[PDB]
Amino acid sequence: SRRWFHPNITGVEAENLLLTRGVDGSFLARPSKSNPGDFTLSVRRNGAVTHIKIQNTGDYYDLYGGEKFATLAELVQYYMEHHGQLKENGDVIELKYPLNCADPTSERWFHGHLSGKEAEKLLTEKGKHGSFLVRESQSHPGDFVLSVRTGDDKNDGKSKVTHVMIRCQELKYDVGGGERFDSLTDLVEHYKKNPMVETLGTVLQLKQPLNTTRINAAEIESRVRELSKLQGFWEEFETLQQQECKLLYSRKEGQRQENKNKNRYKNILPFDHTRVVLHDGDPNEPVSDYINANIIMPEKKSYIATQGCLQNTVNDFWRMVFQENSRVIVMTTKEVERGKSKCVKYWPDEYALKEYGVMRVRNVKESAAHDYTLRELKLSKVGQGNTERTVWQYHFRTWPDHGVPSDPGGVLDFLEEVHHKQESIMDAGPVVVHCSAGIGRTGTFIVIDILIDIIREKGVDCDIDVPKTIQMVRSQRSGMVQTEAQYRFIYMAVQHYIETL
Ligand SMILES: Cc1nc(N2CCC3(CC2)CO[C@@H](C)[C@H]3N)c(CO)nc1-c1cccc(Cl)c1Cl
Numbered sequence: 001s002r003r004w005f006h007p008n009i010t011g012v013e014a015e016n017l018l019l020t021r022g023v024d025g026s027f028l029a030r031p032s033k034s035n036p037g038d039f040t041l042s043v044r045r046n047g048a049v050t051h052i053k054i055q056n057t058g059d060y061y062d063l064y065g066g067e068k069f070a071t072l073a074e075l076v077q078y079y080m081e082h083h084g085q086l087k088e089n090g091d092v093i094e095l096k097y098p099l100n101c102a103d104p105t106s107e108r109w110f111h112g113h114l115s116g117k118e119a120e121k122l123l124t125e126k127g128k129h130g131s132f133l134v135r136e137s138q139s140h141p142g143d144f145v146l147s148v149r150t151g152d153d154k155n156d157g158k159s160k161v162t163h164v165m166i167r168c169q170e171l172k173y174d175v176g177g178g179e180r181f182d183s184l185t186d187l188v189e190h191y192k193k194n195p196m197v198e199t200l201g202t203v204l205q206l207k208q209p210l211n212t213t214r215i216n217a218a219e220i221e222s223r224v225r226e227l228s229k230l231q232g233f234w235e236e237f238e239t240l241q242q243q244e245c246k247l248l249y250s251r252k253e254g255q256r257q258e259n260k261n262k263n264r265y266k267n268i269l270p271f272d273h274t275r276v277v278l279h280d281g282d283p284n285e286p287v288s289d290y291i292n293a294n295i296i297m298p299e300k301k302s303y304i305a306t307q308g309c310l311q312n313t314v315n316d317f318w319r320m321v322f323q324e325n326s327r328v329i330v331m332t333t334k335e336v337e338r339g340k341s342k343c344v345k346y347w348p349d350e351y352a353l354k355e356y357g358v359m360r361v362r363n364v365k366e367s368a369a370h371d372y373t374l375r376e377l378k379l380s381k382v383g384q385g386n387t388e389r390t391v392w393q394y395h396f397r398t399w400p401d402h403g404v405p406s407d408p409g410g411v412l413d414f415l416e417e418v419h420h421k422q423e424s425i426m427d428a429g430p431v432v433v434h435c436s437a438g439i440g441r442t443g444t445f446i447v448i449d450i451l452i453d454i455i456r457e458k459g460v461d462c463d464i465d466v467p468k469t470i471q472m473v474r475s476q477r478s479g480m481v482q483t484e485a486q487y488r489f490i491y492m493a494v495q496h497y498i499e500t501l
């Protein structure tokens, strides 16, 4: 249900599409290809088309005149279910009818200009039973080919590849008989639910798109070069974004009245099924189990991804650090950037001692490095001296105000140190990573950390799959990794880490 995003459409084409193929209440979203992180929400209303700017510098989607969101799907879901909220001169703009895109570019199974010879090799060397892909036809421009692998996954002739010709006849697609579809996606979805059966009984099951993003770590440099050609990075990122509609999990607790002002941004909320639940709260507080934070479990180190504190959640943050036995905190922003508070100070001045509700914190020592400041903190519960433990706060301070670092070396040396600290502490809990809304830079640091932990343990003899890792983390907190710039930065960091092995 993300067909309303059109990756290769212009503003002219958007307007004409809404005016000729849509009605009042129709809408679509689209990127500004030249300006990264810029998107447009185009809506038809009163026979005219309004364009609404959406900006993402790396922390969240900022909708002009509206609110801030973790994903465009969560944005669209919000206004398709909360009417009268989106306003112009202040007139209400209704999102009623998604205008579905027919472009297959961002589909996981679509490989564009790929030859039949390449498609078979890939299916043979990387596929399994039910792996499939769609490519543009080499013989007849405008047509396509669906290639499917079937067989026994236990070479020896037990598996095969079957090619199915897809013709384009008067702007519709068909496999030679039966229904004619308005797009390749409709055709593929139809034959995923109703599989073609070959003469003699082979069921051409479309089980999963061919995995082409999982590569050996030594292949990363070549992949980055391919993805960098003028850009394969953009197509792969928007293919990942297309799948964000699978991740609209419930966030009911963060929407409760008692919890609304515990959120930095009211619509950027933790999934219920992975949120950190706080116990032992004040019995006189009706709802005391809430913080805008999620456990991120790789699927040996786990993380808590959370926002920068508010004045009224500092105490809850320390309750969380204590309860989860966290010993390492990563801050991803300065306290203040561009004159705006990005991470309120929740620790004492150096050598000072403060109580934060029932928790007591001493700042033992601060140490300055080039890219970050280390603060050695001692955390304990008031009245229970034997509960004291040291919490090492790594405050990354040189991330640019917009975009990403030009070189990943600083981030990598930082994560390397954080990793060694965590590993030195027996039975340490999850590493807390936070600031801002806790999804952009936070997701980027966490995904880099997960990937380099693989390489650190296994060296060059391991498979890396960047979008699979990101999708896995985004299923535990909304919108982890916000921008294509961060996406490329993750690749560049992995590549750099491998080179310095
Ligand atoms: C992001 C991604 N990209 C893939 N590629 C690369 C980009 C193309 C399609 C195939 C190739 O050509 C482009 C025009 C484009 N259509 C594949 C295939 O394995 N998977 C994923 C993936 C992986 C794990 C989790 C999730 Cl959620 C996803 Cl979406």
Ligand SMILES: [Cl-]
Pocket (backbone or CB within 6 Å): 126, 127, 128, 131, 208, 209, 210, 211
């Ligand atoms: Cl596969």
Ligand SMILES: [Cl-]
Pocket (backbone or CB within 6 Å): 332, 434, 435, 436, 437, 438, 439, 440, 441, 442, 443
């Ligand atoms: Cl962040």
